[PDB]
Design a protein around this ligand. Sequence first.
Ligand SMILES: Cc1cc2nc3c(=O)[nH]c(=O)nc-3n(C[C@H](O)[C@H](O)[C@H](O)COP(=O)(O)O)c2cc1C
Ligand SMILES: Cc1cc2nc3c(=O)[nH]c(=O)nc-3n(C[C@H](O)[C@H](O)[C@H](O)COP(=O)(O)O)c2cc1C
Ligand SMILES: Nc1ncnc2c1ncn2[C@@H]1O[C@H](COP(=O)(O)OP(=O)(O)OP(=O)(O)O)[C@@H](O)[C@H]1O
Ligand SMILES: Nc1ncnc2c1ncn2[C@@H]1O[C@H](COP(=O)(O)OP(=O)(O)OP(=O)(O)O)[C@@H](O)[C@H]1O
Ligand SMILES: [Mg+2]
Ligand SMILES: [Mg+2]
Ligand SMILES: [Mg+2]
Ligand SMILES: [Mg+2]
Lengths: 330, 330
Amino acid sequence: MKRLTYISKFSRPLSGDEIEAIGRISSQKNQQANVTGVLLCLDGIFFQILEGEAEKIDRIYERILADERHTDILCLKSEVEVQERMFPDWSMQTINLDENTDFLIRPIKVLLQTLTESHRILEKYTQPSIFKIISQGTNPLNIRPKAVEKIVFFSDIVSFSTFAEKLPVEEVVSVVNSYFSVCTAIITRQGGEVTKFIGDCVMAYFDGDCADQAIQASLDILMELEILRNSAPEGSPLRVLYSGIGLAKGKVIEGNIGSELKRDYTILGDAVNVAARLEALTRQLSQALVFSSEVKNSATKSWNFIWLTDSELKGKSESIDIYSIDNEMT
Amino acid sequence: MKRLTYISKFSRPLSGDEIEAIGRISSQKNQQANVTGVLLCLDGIFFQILEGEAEKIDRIYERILADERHTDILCLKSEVEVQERMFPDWSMQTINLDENTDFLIRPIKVLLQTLTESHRILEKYTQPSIFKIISQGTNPLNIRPKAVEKIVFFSDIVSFSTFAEKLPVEEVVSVVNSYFSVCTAIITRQGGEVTKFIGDCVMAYFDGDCADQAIQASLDILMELEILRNSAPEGSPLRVLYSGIGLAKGKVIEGNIGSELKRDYTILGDAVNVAARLEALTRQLSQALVFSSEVKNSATKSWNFIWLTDSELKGKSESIDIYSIDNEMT
Ligand SMILES: Cc1cc2nc3c(=O)[nH]c(=O)nc-3n(C[C@H](O)[C@H](O)[C@H](O)COP(=O)(O)O)c2cc1C
Ligand SMILES: Cc1cc2nc3c(=O)[nH]c(=O)nc-3n(C[C@H](O)[C@H](O)[C@H](O)COP(=O)(O)O)c2cc1C
Ligand SMILES: Nc1ncnc2c1ncn2[C@@H]1O[C@H](COP(=O)(O)OP(=O)(O)OP(=O)(O)O)[C@@H](O)[C@H]1O
Ligand SMILES: Nc1ncnc2c1ncn2[C@@H]1O[C@H](COP(=O)(O)OP(=O)(O)OP(=O)(O)O)[C@@H](O)[C@H]1O
Ligand SMILES: [Mg+2]
Ligand SMILES: [Mg+2]
Ligand SMILES: [Mg+2]
Ligand SMILES: [Mg+2]
């Protein structure tokens, strides 16, 4: 028996009778799948708890995510291996709190709207990786630091300073946000983790043995930016949006770094400097992507590697061989 | 009539009869101050809503913060100018939810514990500045970007790379966390805002006309680190913890920067590069603090300025005069 707690936002106003409809059909289908649950709503928020044989709970969740009447689904708690039902009588109890006027419910309702509204805001300033840890029972604050090998990804906008100097405030922030959205979408898709924004710079990291995914994410970004420059409206700043990318591999510390006020779950190590140095090198070269030989040698696909005989490393130890990929992008 | 919503964590286990005690005395004192309220608890969490003439609500909050039986107080919502009471009958209704076994309360209780536990974790990965915006009614996600003058503060550990190379993982993270805690405590005290951690680096910012507070925060850090080196145990890594500090002034963009997944409320501008360049200069010099002439000229106190005739700026336009403060720290 799995059990699943999630909250979501109405995709549009819903009458109490439309919510009742969701309640009824949910009851008929849950009663068949052995599922019991409770569906709460409170001023445009859905809350649901759903429990049953995991396999069937997974299918039900999957089509719940497919329903157009709510959006911003966030799984708050996923319990596996539960040995007893919380609400064993209700296939689906629908509790509409907008209409419930009991006086013991008065205070509990106002807190719930306060905490949920607050929590929804904090979500957008949080990395979605923390929520994956939270949902699955682990308190991320209690993870202990560890030394681990990573591919470190650095990307930085070329000559961002001139956007700022010649463009309105709203427009400059639109350019950098568009860039971070393109990069974030592609890195996450390839298994990487965007861990920090540093001005016009994206710092992400991949598992140590995911050099092929790092290289492919980098090539797809460069492809996505080319398509974005060519397709932008007449006179759009997106037409002159270029990026460099540097990749390096090495052993870094991963853990909670910060003060009492505020911590980050992120990495720390020399491989971060190297990837930053490699990314800056791309201003010197005609290639937009450069990466270390340890990245080259950790790739398993037969990439079209090109050896950059001009290495140029400063602040490093042994001379660093720099490679790129030879294609029409570079 | 103000109204105040806060949550806190028990500082120690509390019997239901101790919680009842808090309820009774709260009732007797609230009834006198015209205050009505509701005090909820749920597995080591206090929730309270309190309303009355702001002036008297402020005094009551102040001694609530002084009570040793709860900790981690976070004000969730502060409403000013309220024109009607939510709970006009109860001076203090105490609702113990650990004991309430009603079945309409069953689901609402389990969600509340889920959201609160989740929210408490997210607090520690959030900047406390966001909560000040949230509590006071403003949705920070809806603030629009703006060009504004700031003092930018950069500080960076000297030769952190050798801590990592020669120390255990747990110990390295202890050193950098101790450093971020010292800096954060002093900057916040002087009115500055710590906005980003970048490896072993602290990036904070002050209001544009707070050069004196920026300079004083910097001097106090250097003083605090000296005391921390001299007082550390025999053989402690804290004995070799040194920092540089760079300050620069200029017009920066402030606003929400990031992707759909994750945003930061932070700044963007050339003054950030300059402060980073000035901080790195301190490795060349015997002074641990260096700052631009625009910082020097924005100070109103008669500081003991010293003109550093060796300027050395690269990536800047007009030659930058670099100043420091002449004292036994430098
Ligand atoms: C907040 C919300 C919660 C829902 N919960 C359930 C549920 O628990 N069980 C279920 O079968 N359908 C649930 N649904 C509806 C499903 O997404 C889907 O519409 C339904 O299962 C399809 O059944 P049908 O093909 O017979 O019409 C929910 C919809 C919404 C908006
Ligand atoms: C969660 C918690 C909530 C409290 N709420 C109130 C309150 O609403 N009004 C009040 O007068 N005291 C409240 N107190 C107690 C005050 O902090 C303080 O102990 C009391 O007001 C002092 O009264 P006395 O000096 O007469 O003993 C609360 C204490 C705790 C732990
Ligand atoms: N050392 C630094 N640490 C943190 N943020 C920085 C640093 N230097 C610059 N930034 C931030 O990055 C923004 C862009 O700086 P950057 O050096 O990338 O300039 P650019 O004009 O894009 O040129 P380039 O082609 O060299 O990348 C700056 O406005 C500042 O917000
Ligand atoms: N360009 C960069 N961008 C972001 N983080 C960086 C960058 N360079 C280094 N870091 C992070 O900072 C950590 C320390 O690097 P740093 O350059 O401060 O070295 P250091 O040994 O402390 O020497 P220094 O005396 O020059 O400061 C690195 O391990 C990495 O985590
Ligand atoms: Mg740039
Ligand atoms: Mg940059
Ligand atoms: Mg350093
Ligand atoms: Mg550094």
